[PDB]
């Protein structure tokens, strides 16, 4: 949580993915 | 429609034709382009989490407890935004497929029969010219209108 | 008779993204927002010496 | 059913009949009345956000940061409640249409054939008396029971 | 499928057969067992709300307002988790029924016709041996393949 300069905002989580595509459901 | 095509290499949304000429997977660049544009803009709006909140200047323990609790609250809220808009983009994708399907139904009318999920069996015969007419949005109902009716009379009897 | 079908893309991607109604669902293409890989383990300069 | 009728001016939920007598959009006052009653009560419960939280009496900076952060947290939570119950009322509307459709299926049984979405083709003939019987909940299966069977034998052969 | 069977006393997911031998409700122990296992594990993960947050050691009023506001925030968040995963388990149940239905479609192929919702009318005749073959996952398409085709030719003409 302690950062200096242009740093990504600190977050207390493990995964943060945004879906940008389709539900992959093959055959 | 509950089938994902691995053959579509061109686009997120497309068509699979089987005529006399051949059989092919063919994407629809317009739909997938607009989808990528909209989801790019969505992602940018998502990134607009305002987490810059900071103060340049038993109290220290209170500031400690406060900062920590607000951190957990906002991480939960951010994972919430992520969940929400993950479903929202997936639903957006669903709606795009639906709209493609309606674009095809509109032009075909009764010259075709909805086999199932998203398939159409023409009563007439389609070249890849007459296929890419439908894809291009230029298929004309009258061209084959009676031609289909005749074959309907083979399903009637 | 000649047929035309409508469908959507599907690719070999193990990307998993969490919806509201369902968690851990395979999605074709995702975008990550978290960065833990750059732990660093070293205190370099930040625009100038420290 | 994925069609909204602009002709329904009477009610949120209704019927469209085409018999010998004529063709008409006709609402079902009971369903839409109960819908409006339930959504009125829902709205009242929504308005029950308890935002009265207030205290009549580096600290000032801490009270400042606290009040502000709690404000943002609760605005996010309130927009969440709004999103949730917006979907909930829309789903409620869906379920109401479903229930109207089941009310019609129950009475008609095999005297009618579900054309598609929410449409029924009677095998018999319905006056607006026999239409407003279905709407009134007073349609009797036996009255036309064999009358339909006969015409079924025209779809059989 | 929008029908809950009160007759299923064995399992959450099952089958209803009507052959010459008899008619019976019969569960599928595997599916319901895996469902109970997964929901047990889900419940355990839900219980993992970390509400142990506590500090062993106008300020008292500030600690008062803080603790209270955080309490309300976290109660709202916990009811949110509950809502979310209630829908998630219900959707999980839906998907389990879907998968059972696909398991049956796969084996039956064209030896059967999907009557509606989740029903299959065999074109051939099934003992409870040939029923518990499908349930056991051991139904063979060829055994009856032509036997069905013949009867299809009675629906063709």
Features:
27 residues; 0% helix; little secondary structure; 5 chains; part of a larger assembly
Description:
This is part of a larger assembly, with 5 copies of chain A. With 27 residues, chain A is largely without helices or strands. The first copy, chain A, is built from no helices and 1 strand. The first copy, chain A, starts with 16 loop residues before the first strand and ends in an 8-residue tail after the last strand. Chains in contact: A-B, A-C, B-C, B-D, B-E, C-E, D-E. The D-E interface holds D 53, 55, 57, 59, 62-63, 66, 70, 73, 77, 80, 84 and E 58-59, 61-62, 65-66, 69, 73, 76, 80, 83. Strand 5 (119-122) of chain B pairs antiparallel with strand 1 of chain C, so a sheet runs across the interface.
Blueprint (SSEs and pairs):
The structure is cut from a larger assembly and holds 5 copies of chain A.
Chain A: E1 17-19
PDB class: viral protein/immune system
Keywords: immune system, VIRAL PROTEIN-IMMUNE SYSTEM complex
Entry title: Crystal structure of chimeric hemagglutinin cH5/1 in complex with broad protective antibody 3E1
